[PDB]
Amino acid sequence: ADYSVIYNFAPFFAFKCYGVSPTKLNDLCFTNVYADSFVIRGNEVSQIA
Amino acid sequence: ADYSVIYNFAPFFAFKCYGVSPTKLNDLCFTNVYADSFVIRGNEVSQIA
């Protein structure tokens, strides 16, 4: 997993991580990763938390 | 030093201060001030910390 290339795919501003830090994702080793994708409204982004 | 005129020079939103507060900068008296200027990408601003 190379998390330093994600910035080259989408025009977002910054991550928002809860249990870890965005800069420390290149050192830890996990068991499985899951990715969920969808489209919502502008003011409903704060509800994903 | 008058830090209330800085808002009239650049179209930024707000300060981001770490050791002090932006509203209390008119009272303290320092020894020297340094200013560094450059241009970076949009998503690399969060790395200046």
Ligand SMILES: *[C@@H]1O[C@H](CO)[C@@H](O)[C@H](O)[C@H]1NC(C)=O
């Ligand atoms: C720096 O500040 C103004 C904005 O108030 C800018 O338009 C201009 O390039 C500079 N000021 C002058 C007098 O040139």
